[PDB]
Amino acid sequence: GQQYTAAIKGRTFRNEKELRDFIEKFKGR
């Protein structure tokens, strides 16, 4: 699969499950 390359620079995710959670962290401002 097309792994996320833009979405996040310097921190990539292998499991979208963890990105769904870290996403909850970015969305908060």
Structural commentary:
The PDB classes it as de novo protein. Keywords: non-natural amino acids, de novo protein design, rugged folding energy landscape, structural frustration, DE novo protein. The assembly is monomeric. This protein has 29 residues and is mostly helical. Helix content is 38%, strand content 0%. It has 1 helix and no strands. The protein has one helix at residues 16-26. The termini are far apart.
Summed up:
The protein has 29 residues and is mainly α. The chain has one helix and no strands.
What attributes does this structure have?
monomer, 29 residues, mainly alpha, 38% helix, 0% strand, de novo protein
Question: How are the secondary structure elements laid out?
Answer:
Blueprint lengths: L15 H11 L3
What's the N-to-C terminus distance?
Answer: 31 Å
Major β-sheet annotation: none
Report the radius of gyration as a whole number of Å: 9 Å
Structural class: mainly alpha
What is the N-to-C order of secondary-structure elements (H for helix, E for strand)? Answer: H
Shape: globular
Number of helices: 1
Strands, count? 0
| Percent of sequence in beta strands | under 5%
Number of domains: 1
* Assembly annotation: monomer
Kindly state the percentage of residues in helix: 25-40%
PDB class: de novo protein
Keywords: synthetic protein, non-natural amino acids, de novo protein design, rugged folding energy landscape, structural frustration, DE novo protein
Assembly: monomeric
Entry title: Protein folding on a highly rugged landscape: Experimental observation of glassy dynamics and structural frustration
